[PDB]
């Protein structure tokens, strides 16, 4: 098929294994430790929050409500991106000044380990529990003092890399299964490519590789995507893979409807104008991007000890 051939020139299917990030070779011990930490709520000062709290791996890998905390964030509330397939994105979620990218931006996997809690607090918490020390020793053989903030970050990054979702219908199509998509979805695929959405949403995650001075604004009829004043603020073109599971949408999380998310992105300025039927065809296509959520065995964490820093009280 020429459609299949074109699709393969613009996109790629999720591979069986994730790409190695910054030389972080995955091992069973690192991944297991990273998983424990991903679900570990005692890294937060309140002891009520863990990565899974905002990136629920059972519900889209993201958060349902905009938030102002996490990753040492000090500004207004913003939507949370999904951890699913984040490892394939070169650009990270961005909701701010283009001028700040140079010094503050990093890969998704690395941005994920930016924390609000201080390094000393975290290390002390982890060292207070014998089992964590053993897990760090298992993950970092040969290191005399394995429990460090950097090693913690490396183990979490190892686990983040495993959160990929292969075998979506679209990936099967890319790989040759012409029947993986029905006619309605194939029409959506052709339109996605013919209307220029691929200028910003392409590659392995259909987005996630570049920043653009175009973002959602609250004026289908209630929202729109427009250029920011003086291109001062930029946003990362959203990776659309698994979009079916990641509502709400955009940097603000103001849109819950997938059809509307598609509609506001069809504009004359961007050269992506669409009529109502085409919007619906593209929606059909985007629904074929849902892959297999990885199976996760909930980790059994170790009990706190006398040396484990205690939860910090509620005082806003
Ligand atoms: C809610 C209070 C959060 C907690 C706890 C954690 N994360 Fe998060 N994360 C959150 C938001 C609102 C954002 C957009 C953020 C800016 O601050 O970066 C993110 C982003 C990420 C990413 C980037 C994904 C991408 O750009 O494709 C990753 C991979 C990520 N978060 C991972 C992660 C991990 C491993 C966490 C525990 C150490 C964690 N986050 C906590 C909100 C929240
Ligand atoms: C670059 C100039 C783009 C073109 C052309 C298209 N999109 Fe886009 N899209 C772009 C950005 C920078 C963003 C993030 C905006 C923000 O305010 O956060 C998006 C976002 C979307 C979404 C929401 C995805 C999500 O939140 O998970 C969808 C559904 C989407 N874009 C679809 C889409 C379609 C169908 C397009 C062709 C008509 C299209 N986009 C073009 C940037 C760009």
Number of neighbours of residue 211 by Cβ within 10 angstroms: 17
Q: Whose CA is nearest to atom 8 of ligand 1?
A: 112
**C-alpha distance across the termini of the chain, in Å:** 59
Sign of the alpha-carbon dihedral angle for 6, 11, 15, 20: positive
Q: Do 203 and 140 fall within a single domain?
A: no
Grouping H, G, I as helix, E, B as strand and the rest as coil, residue 11 is: strand
Q: Whose CA is nearest to atom 4 of ligand 1?
A: 70
Q: What is the DSSP string of 184-214?
A: HHHHHHHHHHHTTGGGTS-BTTTS-S-EESE
| Beta bridge pairs of residue 234 | 96
| Beta bridge pairs of residue 217 | 224
Residues 251 and 79: beta-carbon distance below 8 Å: yes
Q: Do 302 and 157 fall within a single domain?
A: yes
Name the experiment that determined this structure: X-ray
Q: Do 212 and 301 fall within a single domain?
A: no
Nearest to 101 by CA among 87, 86, 89, 91: 91
We report the CATH number of the domain holding residue 177 as 1.10.760.10
User: Cα–Cα distance between 170 and 240 in angstroms, integer?
Assistant: 12
Ligand 2 atom nearest the C-alpha of 270 is: 5
Residues 294 and 165: beta-carbon distance below 8 Å: yes
Q: Do 255 and 270 fall within a single domain?
A: yes
Residues 63 and 73: beta-carbon distance below 8 Å: no
Q: Do 115 and 39 fall within a single domain?
A: yes
Does 148 show up as a binding residue in the annotation? no
- Measured from the CB, is residue 14 less than 6 Å from ligand 1? no
- Measured from the CB, is residue 67 less than 6 Å from ligand 1? yes
Q: Do 12 and 24 fall within a single domain?
A: no
Q: What is the DSSP string of 57-113?
A: TTTTTS-SS-BS-STT--SS-B-----TTGGG-SS---EEEGGGHHHH---HHHHTT
Residues 157 and 110: beta-carbon distance below 8 Å: yes
Residue 248: is the preceding peptide bond cis (ω within 30°)? Answer: yes
Instruction: Enumerate residues 6+ apart whose C-beta is below 8 A from 125.
Output: 42, 43, 308, 309
User: Cα–Cα distance between 79 and 152 in angstroms, integer?
Assistant: 25
**Computed over its alpha carbons, how large is the radius of gyration of the chain?**
21
Q: Whose CA is nearest to atom 35 of ligand 2?
A: 262
Grouping H, G, I as helix, E, B as strand and the rest as coil, residue 287 is: helix
Task: Return the ∠ at Cα 74 (arms to 73 and 80), rounded to 5°.
Answer: 40
The alpha carbon of 67 is separated from its chain's Cα centroid by a whole number of angstroms, namely 15
Give Cα separations from 280 to 22, 24, 40, 286 (angstroms).
40, 41, 41, 10
Q: Which ligand is nearest to the CA of 280?
A: 2
For residue 260, the CA-to-ligand 1 centroid distance in Å is 25
Can 183 be counted among the known catalytic residues? no
Q: Do 46 and 76 fall within a single domain?
A: yes
For residue 247, the CA-to-ligand 2 centroid distance in Å is 14
Residues 197 and 265: beta-carbon distance below 8 Å: yes
Q: Do 112 and 242 fall within a single domain?
A: no
For residue 76, the enclosing domain spans 17-164+293-316
Ligand 1 atom nearest the C-alpha of 73 is: 17
User: Cα–Cα distance between 106 and 75 in angstroms, integer?
Assistant: 19
For residue 126, the CA-to-ligand 2 centroid distance in Å is 40
Residues 237 and 207: beta-carbon distance below 8 Å: yes
Q: Whose CA is nearest to atom 36 of ligand 1?
A: 51
Residue located via tokens 């959160």: 163
For residue 174, the CA-to-ligand 1 centroid distance in Å is 30
Q: Which ligand is nearest to the CA of 160?
A: 1
Q: What is the DSSP string of 225-255?
A: EEEPGGG-EEEEPPP-TTGGG-PSBTTT--B
Domain count, the chain: 2
Ligand 2 atom nearest the C-alpha of 246 is: 27
Residues 250 and 237: beta-carbon distance below 8 Å: no
- Residue burial 72-111, b: 16+ Cβ < 10 Å; e: rest: eeeeeebbbbbbbbbbbbebbbbbbebeeeeeebebbbeb
Q: Do 156 and 212 fall within a single domain?
A: no
Does 251 show up as a binding residue in the annotation? yes
Q: Do 268 and 180 fall within a single domain?
A: yes
Strands lying side by side in the sheet with 233-236: 95-97, 233-236, 211-212
Q: Which residues line ligand 2 (CB under 6 A)?
A: 195-197, 199-201, 212, 214-216, 235, 237-238, 240, 243, 246, 249-251, 261-262, 265-266, 270, 272, 274, 282
Catalytic annotation, pick one of 114, 167, 227, 259: 114
Kindly give the interhelix angle for 130-139 and 28-38, rounded to the nearest 10 degrees: 140
Q: Do 77 and 179 fall within a single domain?
A: no
Please state whether 258 falls in left (phi above 0), alpha (psi between -120 and 50) or beta: alpha
Residues 86 and 207: beta-carbon distance below 8 Å: no
Residues 94 and 213: beta-carbon distance below 8 Å: no
Does 200 show up as a binding residue in the annotation? yes
Residues 78 and 67: beta-carbon distance below 8 Å: yes
Q: Do 193 and 91 fall within a single domain?
A: no
The total number of residues shown for the chain amounts to 316
DSSP classification of residue 52: H
- With 0-12 / 13-18 / 19 or more C-beta atoms within 10 angstroms meaning exposed / middle / buried, residue 141 is exposed
């Amino acid at each position: 098929d020429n459609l299949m051939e074109r699709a393969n020139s613009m996109f790629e299917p999720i591979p069986k294994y994730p790409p190695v990030i910054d030389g972080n070779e995955l091992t069973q011990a690192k991944v297991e430790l990273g998983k424990m930490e991903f679900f570990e709520p005692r890294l937060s000062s309140s002891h009520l929050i863990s990565c899974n709290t905002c990136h629920n791996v059972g519900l889209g890998g993201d958060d349902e409500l905009p938030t102002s905390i996490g990753h040492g964030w000090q500004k207004g509330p913003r939507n949370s991106p999904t951890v699913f397939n984040a490892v394939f994105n070169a650009a990270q979620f961005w909701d701010g000044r283009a001028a700040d990218l140079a010094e503050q931006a990093k890969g998704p996997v690395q941005a994920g380990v930016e924390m609000s809690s201080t390094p000393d607090r975290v290390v002390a918490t982890l060292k207070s529990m014998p089992e964590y020390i053993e897990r760090f020793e298992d993950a970092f053989p040969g290191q005399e003092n394995p429990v460090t903030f950097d090693n913690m970050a490396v183990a979490i990054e190892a686990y983040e890399a495993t959160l990929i979702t292969p075998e979506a219908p679209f990936d099967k199509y890319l790989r040759g299964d012409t029947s993986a998509l029905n006619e309605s979805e194939k029409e959506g695929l052709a339109l996605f490519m013919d209307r220029g959405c691929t200028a910003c949403h392409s590659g392995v995650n259909l987005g996630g590789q570049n920043y653009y001075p175009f973002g959602l604004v609250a004026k289908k009829g209630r929202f729109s995507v427009t250029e920011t004043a003086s291109d001062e603020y930029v946003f990362r073109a959203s990776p659309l893979r698994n979009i079916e599971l990641t509502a709400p949408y955009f940097h603000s999380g103001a849109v819950w409807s997938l059809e509307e998310a598609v509609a506001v992105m069809g504009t004359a300025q961007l050269g992506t104008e669409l009529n109502n039927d085409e919007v619906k065809s593209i929606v059909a296509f985007l629904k074929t991007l849902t892959g297999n959520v990885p199976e996760v065995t909930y980790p059994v964490l170790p009990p706190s000890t006398a040396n484990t820093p205690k939860p910090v009280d509620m005082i806003p």
